[PDB]
Amino acid sequence: IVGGYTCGANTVPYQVSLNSGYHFCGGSLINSQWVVSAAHCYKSGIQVRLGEDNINVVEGNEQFISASKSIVHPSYNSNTLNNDIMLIKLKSAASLNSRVASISLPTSCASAGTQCLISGWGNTKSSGTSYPDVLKCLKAPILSDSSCKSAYPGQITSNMFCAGYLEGGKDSCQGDSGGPVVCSGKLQGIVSWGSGCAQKNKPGVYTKVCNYVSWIKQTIASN
Ligand SMILES: [Ca+2]
């Protein structure tokens, strides 16, 4: 997260870190046994880390649980990042509490102008590299479809939306991928892609979760 703020420990209780020996992506807890992330974050050997603030220090609210299965969206295209969504099942159910909690799925899509909270342990520099140890947060609005499409000609599908600031300086970034965009207590987006980070006229691009609620629910019901 570039140009954000320190969230505070366990203030974002649905935020997860995906760990394969090191943090490599975010995710969102959507029930005691399932996490949503970005398909471009797929790898084998995932451990899900819940209850984290400092990802390099054991602070006392963590739960580390190995994934038993990952399911990439059936129409994911790694060239265009269309359908950049994956589900991860935990080998055991997490213990839900005030610091480890699920986030609701949307019953309806959000609109341009809605304010959302974006979070992660990604790079904090727009030109340069610096990785935080504690969770960072950014409040940002959803941008219009027309401004999103104008920013990225020929690249924005009906399964994407843009959020952030066209002036630059505030955005998600590398290492935030797969993490949440929450608006009015609903998971509306997944950190997907962008040109660089926090660049002028190049806002963040997010997976449009409301398009996938049917697939998520059916997949969970049968796995
Ligand atoms: Ca920790």
Side-chain angles (χ1 to χ4, degrees):
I1 302 286
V2 177
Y5 66 95
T6 295
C7 300
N10 306 116
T11 62
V12 189
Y14 52 81
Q15 173 81 55
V16 317
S17 164
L18 306 181
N19 187 284
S20 62
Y22 47 84
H23 166 86
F24 67 91
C25 273
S28 304
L29 193 66
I30 58 169
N31 69 28
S32 63
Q33 297 199 277
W34 289 87
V35 164
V36 163
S37 186
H40 86 255
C41 291
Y42 170 79
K43 60 170 79 177
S44 60
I46 294 175
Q47 187 185 58
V48 176
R49 297 192 171 203
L50 304 99
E52 284 284 16
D53 190 44
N54 191 318
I55 49 166
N56 272 317
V57 179
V58 180
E59 297 178 292
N61 292 297
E62 302 91 345
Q63 302 177 43
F64 299 170
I65 303 172
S66 297
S68 57
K69 169 187 285 195
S70 288
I71 306 170
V72 168
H73 193 270
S75 299
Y76 169 58
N77 181 320
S78 61
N79 294 323
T80 66
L81 296 185
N82 198 30
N83 310 295
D84 194 12
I85 189 173
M86 76 166 301
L87 287 168
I88 302 167
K89 186 180 191 186
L90 302 183
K91 273 178 190 268
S92 61
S95 292
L96 303 184
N97 61 229
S98 68
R99 296 180 172 76
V100 175
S102 50
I103 190 64
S104 293
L105 294 176
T107 61
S108 154
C109 304
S111 305
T114 291
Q115 296 281 340
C116 305
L117 179 71
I118 306 174
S119 50
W121 288 279
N123 189 2
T124 65
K125 304 311 282 287
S126 67
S127 289
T129 304
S130 185
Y131 285 83
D133 294 302
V134 296
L135 186 65
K136 304 287 173 170
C137 274
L138 178 65
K139 288 184 177 186
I142 296 178
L143 300 178
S144 64
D145 193 47
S146 65
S147 69
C148 189
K149 290 185 167 167
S150 291
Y152 291 107
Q155 298 157 69
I156 301 300
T157 73
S158 69
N159 303 307
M160 298 174 193
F161 69 87
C162 285
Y165 296 90
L166 293 177
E167 61 276 21
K170 289 175 287 201
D171 197 2
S172 56
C173 197
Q174 226 264 350
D176 296 318
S177 289
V181 180
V182 166
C183 324
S184 301
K186 307 302 190 184
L187 179 74
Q188 292 287 8
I190 300 163
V191 177
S192 183
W193 69 271
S195 173
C197 309
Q199 303 295 298
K200 186 179 160 59
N201 291 143
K202 293 292 180 182
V205 187
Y206 299 94
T207 310
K208 185 175 186 173
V209 170
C210 64
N211 291 2
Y212 296 98
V213 173
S214 281
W215 171 76
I216 295 167
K217 289 175 168 299
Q218 78 88 4
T219 300
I220 291 168
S222 284
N223 287 276

